[PDB]
Amino acid sequence: MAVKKIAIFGATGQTGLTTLAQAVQAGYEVTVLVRDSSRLPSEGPRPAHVVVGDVLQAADVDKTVAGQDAVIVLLGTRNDLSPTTVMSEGARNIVAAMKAHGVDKVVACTSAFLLWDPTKVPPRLQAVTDDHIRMHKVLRESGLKYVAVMPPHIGDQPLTGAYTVTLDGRGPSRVISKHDLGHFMLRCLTTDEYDGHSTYPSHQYQ
């Protein structure tokens, strides 16, 4: 296929695990970056290549980005709402590696709160949102072919492929299943129509 080799950052995470499973089923040759302490589960889908290391190390990000057709970014801090720069600094490393290695397409997940009135963002989520804002600025200013995926609440509902994709604004539902979010990140590999846009995927599960 046109896009065949992809790097996934955050493959062990809630959305990353289903994105990886869908990508392997769809025939992608997937490279993952995993932290040493948190490898992919034994019984699950196996990627083609594993780099062990940290997104905060340029060397490890370089190893993961080299030779790819595109990059998916599903970094996050799991339940931890503390102040952080891991997403934005990870994105700085990813941008630098993509430029050095001639990779252009990056589909990266931040949050629908980037499209909210800031007075309404829940204060408990402001520290994480501040880093999503930093991350989105890094990716927007890079000049790369960047699809800004900005989901609302990530739920455990099924894969449908039937969700709404709202461009450059908030969508009509406040949930997307983790499986649909991963499906959309992969869909963004096969089209240029979302490049340079913010995208809000959402659905009503019924």
Place this chain on the structure above:
Amino acid sequence: HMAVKKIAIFGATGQTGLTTLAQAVQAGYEVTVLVRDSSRLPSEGPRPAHVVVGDVLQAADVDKTVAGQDAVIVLLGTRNDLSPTTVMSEGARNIVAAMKAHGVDKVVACTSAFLLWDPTKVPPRLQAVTDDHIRMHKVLRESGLKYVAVMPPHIGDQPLTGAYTVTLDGRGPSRVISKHDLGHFMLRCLTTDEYDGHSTYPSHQYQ
């Protein structure tokens, strides 16, 4: 007050520096910049009147930049430092000494809104630069110079509005200021004494 025409800008090649410099040149200021590498200044459009090539850590280079000015704008930063660093505070000591030696009495300097919030708001990677912002702020406050402390939140890329809010000695209502609005505010601080001795938090809601 005293009419400011000549200014030095430190950090003029940075993201806020570049637009503060452009806006200052367009408004008519006679601008002197201290730059480590003159190729980082734009070759077209508005250009400063005077370029000193050198380093804020070298007292002589700072002295040459501050000589003859009416006021000083400080937009230094060290984005890549994540462990203890003293570049900004040592630069500020050199700036203060040069201002005292040359009779320059007005300094408008950028640190960050972390200095207005609980220290646990600081991401761990940013503790070292925040600690050095605190040292720089203390150097400027203890100098006896007329000092406006500008303590912005996230610096964004939205177009200049001139319509942002400034909150005095406290935090305002948004957590972003465009680099263009931040630069506009630094220049506004040259036209008035009202912020002298205060901390200022510029912020705005864009679109």
